[PDB]
């Protein structure tokens, strides 16, 4: 109901894509496969001890849609969960196609309150190709 204060996110790209994939691959949970025509949502709750969310991601051969939403939900855990496809939603990063197969894409956002970030990996426009998403999320103080 009440009106939130929402800061603009920071977004950047960086060219060290080969090293990025090498490092995150060292955890297989950090590589997700987004089926043709599918949308995958990574839910990332806010930490009480945190003030910002940071994310980075890349793909192998093709672009993919990416955006970020904030869901005003008091989450029991701070545990990250992944989901394949009442609460208020705000748009932090609009879902656009990203050339994250050529560069690492990254960004950050100041917590607007307690809630849950929705990282959207959107492959709904792809008729024939699955995508391999290499991704990292963490909070800062």
Curated annotation (Swiss-Prot):
One of its GO terms (molecular function) is fatty-acyl-CoA binding. Residues 21-139 form the GOLD domain. GO terms for cellular component: Golgi apparatus; Golgi membrane; membrane; mitochondrion. Ubiquitous, with highest expression in testis and ovary. It comes from the Eukaryota. Keywords: Acetylation, Coiled coil, Golgi apparatus, Host-virus interaction, Lipid biosynthesis, Lipid metabolism, Membrane, Mitochondrion, Phosphoprotein, Steroid biosynthesis. The record marks 36 as: Membrane-binding. Its main location: Golgi. The keyword Lipid biosynthesis applies. It is found in: Golgi apparatus membrane; Mitochondrion. One of its GO terms (biological process) is steroid biosynthetic process. Residues 127-129 are annotated as: Membrane-binding. The central Gln-rich region (Q domain) is involved in binding to PI4KB, TBC1D22A and TBC1D22B. The C-terminal GOLD domain is essential for giantin binding. The GOLD domain is also involved in homodimerization. (Microbial infection) The GOLD domain is involved in binding to the picornaviral protein 3A. Homodimer. Interacts with the C-terminal cytoplasmic domain of giantin/GOLGB1. Interacts with PBR and PKA regulatory subunit RI-alpha. Does not interact with PKA regulatory subunit RI-beta nor PKA regulatory subunit RII-alpha. Interacts (via Q domain) with PI4KB (via N-terminus). Interacts (via Q domain) with TBC1D22A and TBC1D22B; interactions with PI4KB and with TBC1D22A and TBC1D22B are mutually exclusive. Interacts with C10ORF76 and RAB11B. Involved in the maintenance of Golgi structure by interacting with giantin, affecting protein transport between the endoplasmic reticulum and Golgi. Involved in hormone-induced steroid biosynthesis in testicular Leydig cells. Recruits PI4KB to the Golgi apparatus membrane; enhances the enzyme activity of PI4KB activity via its membrane recruitment thereby increasing the local concentration of the substrate in the vicinity of the kinase. This is Golgi resident protein GCP60. It comes from Homo sapiens. The chain holds residues 364 to 528 of 528 of the full protein.
């Amino acid at each position: 109901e009440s009106l939130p204060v929402i800061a603009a996110p920071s977004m950047w790209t960086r060219p060290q894509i080969k090293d990025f994939k090498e490092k995150i691959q060292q955890d297989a949970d950090s590589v997700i496969t987004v089926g043709r025509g599918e949308v995958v949502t990574v839910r990332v709750p806010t930490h009480e001890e945190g003030s910002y969310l940071f994310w980075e991601f890349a793909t192998d051969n093709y672009d993919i849609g990416f955006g970020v939403y904030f869901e005003w939900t008091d989450s029991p855990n701070t545990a990250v969960s992944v989901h394949v496809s009442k609460p208020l939603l705000d748009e932090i990063v609009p879902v656009y196609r990203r050339d994250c197969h050529e560069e690492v894409y990254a960004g950050s956002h100041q917590y607007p309150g307690r809630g849950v970030y929705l990282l959207k990996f959107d492959n709904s426009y792809s008729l024939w190709r699955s995508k391999s998403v290499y991704y990292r999320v963490y909070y800062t103080r």
